[PDB]
């Protein structure tokens, strides 16, 4: 209402009550004019490799992105969550846009001037029928910034469709976003909508205190037998004789078991110590990849697998983990001290190590003159009796992904981590309404190319309720907790420096508490 | 006008011979309707709940689902060695993937399963 | 002869499904180091993995 | 000999597509020909000249 | 319109693969005097114009 | 300057055609191209590549 | 009303129901 | 039949195994699969079936 009344108030806090926590984040955003109000066909460059070809469209619209956990949880909030809860999941969200300001920019005479345009509008619509290509869930920049005092730029919306090389095909779709209905907002108007999450499984924010190969009573023998010797000493040599034993603690690898470890898709191993790696360019040639319509894509991060085995923390899968950048890290070819490499070590209780074989299978039929032969299994699809953990989530990491619209999707938990949703939180798209500049006094049928330079700013609030599954642990000894480091330092972790720059010093997962298998 | 096909069935075989578990079925051991000129036969059937057949094609590919205008905040290993003097030395380097290296982007999904066929030309 | 038969085309599902005559992808087969280069292998049979999506075969008149 | 009737009800999921540009449709060929596709010939023989799938419309992933 | 003959001269008969068949081609079973009705193809129900109407306008059917 | 909206309701007479063989439909072309028909180019210019009439379906006299 | 309130919203779409279609265009 | 087997120690080297956190475990019995094909009842999978002891059987190398 009017011009002198704010359309909303600042809400940032977390409310912990019972099995629920509610997070609220308010930020200040700025929206420019994109593409000078045009839709543009875009494509890969002429010299691009086949694996890098694309075709699509850039739009004049922007969109809002709060699909990272930091956007909602403070570092102290994240600690409170991960130290006390076995699981959590999102329930509902609220979204608000308010305190909208449109401003005119006159760059005349090399001097910039900025004035309020109290009459201009912004257009906002939710894609609640999921009729546009969903580009959230691709881990793009442009989120609400983790620190509440920071002002962020709204990212530009674009999408890809079917390409053959740099060219489109008959099935390529083009979308005009102005062909949707949208709200027009003038200074003093606000925008709200609500969303309910579908029923989704809790994220498992624990590690297992048991391993899948150690589930039996070590004090008692099995009543089942296994083949323990295939020959026996006969005089001066051996002869073929099959012999059988019941497995106890002494031969614990040989016990009959009910379950199998999860599936595998083997990754190459790289060392954080530089001298242990081969002196060669293998970042692509040695990469784990999939092949789709004659194209190779890197499998990154791929299926959830343990980063390393015991005492090998310096090793990680080539493209098998999420890697976050440190504050101020650049885009291209940075050193390893500039990035933060997550560790999925916790899931090695049930999941194969990413850089090892799944196991060994028999390849032949032995006999008197043929010895038994085995082969390493480097790729293992799911088997009946397999169990596994999903990838962990991080404070820096994504929250949800849209499950692709397909006939079949096995265990549709997104591989970068988080909650797979058939109807995710809808895309919220926004743009400044074009305001034409001074027209000619003689009619012209050509479209207007001359506009008044404008941008918008405002406040955005996002409120998410999360359902908690509290830890109820009967173990006697104390557990592992996330804690801040104990010593003195120049800067405090998760703080601003003397220049006002907020930084996140390390990745924080969720799995600190333990449970039995 | 069409001819009604003859009914037959197979059971367990060992070579051309049956086994102990082979089953034989007399169909006249079922109750049936007997119809004379002027009699008719009807029955109804309800299908179970089944998923719709997808009578569309996709206008997007699974490896092209991101916003081409924005970079990822995640990093991938982009170089494993670097020129050192007259040769190279092992040095791990990392990049954020954009549109220029779109094959290297972190993704959430995998293509469906495979069981490879031999290729023949028309 | 081939002119006597009609061969269907499942080309539409290549957006999500592997091409029938190609490998699914490549996996690492060894542990590299200073004196060992990284080696990969083609995957010619791939069982279902968590995170896979696919289309079913089309129907015809 | 006799007559047989079969009656099937099918549930439809209608296309609700927001793309701007027109789509691919199945259409009969445009030119003249000796016989019409999906017709009898001069001898009374019905023929089906090609396979027809279902996937002409498009959707996003 | 259908026509139904007498099959097997009213007998059930044991049938099997021929003696010289490969192992991959062995079978054992029974042929019956009965016939059966088969409408498990789409053409049996949809006309070509009907099939066009279906596939141009619908994202799914069942 | 301002915004203008125009909303028109149209009454339809649906095709109810008993012919056996499939009909002519308007369809987008099948092949690859630099630009898509009825789209913007790399410079943002929308174009209409051809005229489209209404008469694709058929009826008897 | 006033100066800070938009007098309308953007409507573009087509609604197909029965024997009717409704088109809306905003420019 | 003892004479059809290789004279060697393959009970572990030739065994079907899985690999978890740098450890090898025997896959026993593993996924459900047929013990043998037709007329091969004397053959069985190395660790692919349940093996029970007769009354009074001992623990080790019977």
The three-state DSSP-derived secondary structure of B45-114 is CCCCCCCCEECEEECCCCCCCCCCCCCECEEEEEEEEEEECCEEEEEEEEEECCCCCHHHCCCCCEECCE
What's the token pair of residue A469? 């599954």
Q: Which helix (H) or strand (E) holds A269?
A: strand A269-271
List the one residue out of B56, C56, E27, G23 whose CA is nearest residue D17.
Answer: B56
Helix (H, G, I), strand (E, B) or coil at G11: coil
**Contacts with A448 from chain G: Cβ below 8 Å:** none
What Rg, from alpha-carbon coordinates, does chain E have? 20
β-strand partners of A31 = A456
**DSSP symbols for A226-295:** EEEEEEEEETTEEEEEEEEEE--STTGGG---S-EE--EE---EEESSGGGS-SS--TTTTS-EEEETTE
Instruction: Judge: A281–B57 Cβ closer than 8 Å, yes or no.
Output: no
List the one residue out of A366, A362, A385 whose CA is nearest residue A375.
Answer: A362
DSSP state of A252: G
Instruction: Judge: B81–A302 Cβ closer than 8 Å, yes or no.
Output: no
Q: Which of G2, G5, G7, G10 to mutate to test the interface with A (most CBs of A within 10 A)?
A: G10
Q: What are phi and psi of A254, to 5 degrees?
A: -100, 5
Instruction: Judge: E59–D54 Cβ closer than 8 Å, yes or no.
Output: no
Q: Which residue has the tokens 């108030």?
A: A9
Helix (H, G, I), strand (E, B) or coil at A380: strand
- Taking CB atoms and an 8 Å cut-off, how many pairs form between chains E and F? 15
Contact of chains C and H by CB distance (3 or more pairs under 8 angstroms): no
Q: Which residue has the tokens 């290729």?
A: B119
Q: State the SS3 of B16-59.
A: CEECCCCCCCCHHHCCCCCCCCCCCCCCCCCCCCCCCEECEEEC
Strands A359-362 and A374-377: antiparallel
**E strands present in H1-62:** 17-20, 23-26
Q: What are phi and psi of A109, to 5 degrees?
A: 60, 25
β-strand partners of A40 = A58
Q: Do residues A59 and A176 make contact, with C-beta atoms less than 8 angstroms apart? A: no
CATH superfamily of A1-517: Parvovirus coat protein VP1/VP2 (2.170.30.10)
Q: How far, in Å, are A164, A296, A509 from residue A52 at the CA level?
A: 11, 9, 32
Q: State the SS3 of chain D.
A: CECCCCCCCCCEEECCCCCCCCCCCCCCCCCCCCCCCCCECCCCCECCCCCCCCCCEEECC
**Contacts with B51 from chain E: Cβ below 8 Å:** 62
Q: Do residues A89 and A468 make contact, with C-beta atoms less than 8 angstroms apart? A: no
Helix (H, G, I), strand (E, B) or coil at H36: coil
What's the token pair of residue A106? 């006159």
β-strand partners of A295 = A292
Q: Tell me if chain C has a CB within 8 Å of the CB of A77.
A: no
Q: How far is F35 from chain G (nearest CA, A)?
A: 24
Helix (H, G, I), strand (E, B) or coil at A449: coil
β-strand partners of A353 = A306
Q: What are phi and psi of C60, to 5 degrees?
A: -130, 155
List the one residue out of A259, A394, A299, A419 whose CA is nearest residue A340.
Answer: A394
What span, in angstroms and rounded, lies between the C-alpha atoms of F26 and A119? Answer: 44
| Residue H29 preceded by cis peptide, ω within 30 | yes
Please enumerate in sequence order all residues whose Cβ is within 8 A of that of F60, keeping only pairs 6 or more positions apart, or say none: none
Q: Tell me if chain F has a CB within 8 Å of the CB of G27.
A: yes
β-strand partners of A306 = A353
Q: What resolution in angstrom units was achieved for this structure?
A: 2.4
β-strand partners of A63 = A429
List the one residue out of A85, A83, A88 whose CA is nearest residue A72.
Answer: A88
Tell the burial category of F47 from Cβ atoms under 10 Å away from its Cβ (0-12, 13-18, 19+): exposed
**DSSP symbols for A119-169:** T--EEEEE-TT--S---TTS-BS-PPPSSTT-EEEPPEEEEEE-EETTEE-
Q: Which residue has the tokens 């498009």?
A: D58
To the nearest 10°, report the CA torsion of A38, A43, A47, A50. Answer: 170
β-strand partners of G15 = G22
What span, in angstroms and rounded, lies between the C-alpha atoms of A102 and A513? Answer: 49
Q: Do residues A140 and A151 make contact, with C-beta atoms less than 8 angstroms apart? A: no
Q: Where are the alpha helices (DSSP H) in A243-351?
A: none
**E strands present in A411-453:** 419-421, 428-432
Q: How far is E59 from chain B (nearest CA, A)?
A: 5
Q: Which of residues 408-467 of A touch C (CB under 8 A)?
A: 408-415
Q: No. of H helices and E strands in chain F?
A: 0, 1
Contact of chains A and B by CB distance (3 or more pairs under 8 angstroms): yes
Q: Do residues A154 and A141 make contact, with C-beta atoms less than 8 angstroms apart? A: no
**Contacts with D24 from chain A: Cβ below 8 Å:** 170-171
Q: Do residues A377 and A361 make contact, with C-beta atoms less than 8 angstroms apart? A: yes
The method recorded for this entry reads cryo-EM
Q: Tell me if chain B has a CB within 8 Å of the CB of D31.
A: no
Q: Which residue has the tokens 């990035």?
A: A339
DSSP state of A276: G
Q: Which residue has the tokens 């396979």?
A: D51
Instruction: Judge: F27–D30 Cβ closer than 8 Å, yes or no.
Output: no
Q: Which of residues 34-63 of B touch C (CB under 8 A)?
A: 53-54, 57-58, 60-62
What Rg, from alpha-carbon coordinates, does chain D have? 18
Tell the burial category of C1 from Cβ atoms under 10 Å away from its Cβ (0-12, 13-18, 19+): exposed
Q: Do residues A96 and A190 make contact, with C-beta atoms less than 8 angstroms apart? A: yes
Q: Which residue has the tokens 């028999």?
A: A362
List the one residue out of H50, B53, A506, A177 whose CA is nearest residue D54.
Answer: B53
């Amino acid at each position: 209402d009017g011009v002198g009344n704010s359309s909303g108030n600042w809400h940032c806090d977390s409310t912990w009550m019972g099995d629920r926590v509610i997070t609220t984040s308010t930020r200040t955003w700025a929206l420019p004019t994109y593409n000078n109000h045009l839709y543009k066909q875009i494509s890969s460059q002429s010299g691009a490799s086949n694996d890098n070809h694309y075709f699509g469209y850039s739009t004049p619209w922007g969109y809002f992105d709060f699909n990272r956990f930091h956007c909602h949880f403070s570092p102290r909030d994240w600690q409170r969550l991960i130290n006390n809860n076995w699981g959590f999941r999102p329930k509902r969200l609220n979204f608000k846009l308010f305190n909208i300001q449109v401003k005119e920019v006159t760059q005349n005479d090399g001097t910039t001037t900025i004035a309020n345009n109290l009459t201009s509008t912004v257009q906002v619509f939710t894609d609640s029928e999921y009729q546009l290509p969903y580009v959230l869930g691709s881990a793009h920049q442009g989120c609400l910034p983790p620190f509440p005092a920071d002002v962020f730029m709204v990212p530009q919306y674009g999408y890809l469709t079917l390409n053959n090389g740099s060219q489109a095909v008959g099935r390529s779709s083009f979308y005009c976003l102005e062909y949707f209905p949208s709200q027009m907002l003038r200074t003093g108007n606000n925008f709200t909508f609500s969303y309910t999450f579908e029923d989704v499984p809790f994220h498992s924010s624990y590690a297992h205190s048991q391993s899948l190969d150690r589930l039996m009573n070590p004090l008692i023998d099995q009543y089942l037998y296994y083949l323990s010797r295939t020959n026996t000493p006969s005089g001066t040599t051996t002869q073929s004789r099959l012999q059988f034993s019941q497995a106890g603690a002494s031969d614990i690898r040989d016990q009959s078991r009910n379950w199998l470890p999860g599936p595998c898709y083997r990754q190459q191993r790289v060392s954080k110590t530089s001298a242990d790696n081969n002196n060669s360019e293998y970042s692509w040639t040695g990469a784990t990849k999939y092949h789709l319509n004659g194209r190779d894509s890197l499998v990154n991060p791929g299926p959830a697998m343990a980063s390393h085995k015991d005492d090998e923390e310096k090793f990680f899968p080539q493209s098998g983990v999420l890697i976050f950048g440190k504050q101020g890290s650049e885009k291209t070819n940075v050193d390893i001290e500039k990035v933060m490499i997550t560790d999925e070590e916790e899931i090695r209780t049930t999941n194969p190590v990413a850089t090892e074989q799944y196991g060994s299978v028999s390849t032949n039929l032995q006999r008197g003159n043929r010895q038994a032969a085995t082969a390493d299994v480097n790729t293992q699809g799911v088997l009946p009796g397999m169990v596994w953990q999903d990838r962990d989530v991080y404070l820096q990491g994504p929250i949800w992904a849209k499950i692709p619209h397909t006939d079949g999707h096995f265990h549709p938990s997104p591989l970068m981590g988080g909650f797979g949703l058939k109807h995710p939180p809808p895309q919220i798209l926004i743009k400044n309404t074009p305001v034409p500049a001074n027209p000619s006094t003689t009619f012209s049928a050509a479209k207007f190319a001359s506009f008044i330079t404008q941008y918008s700013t405002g406040q955005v609030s996002v409120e998410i309720e999360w359902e908690l599954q509290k830890e109820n642990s009967k173990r006697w000894n104390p557990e592992i907790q996330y804690t801040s480091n104990y010593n003195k330092s120049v800067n405090v972790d998760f703080t601003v420096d003397t220049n006002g720059v907020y930084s996140e010093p390390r990745p924080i997962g969720t799995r600190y508490l333990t449970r039995n298998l």
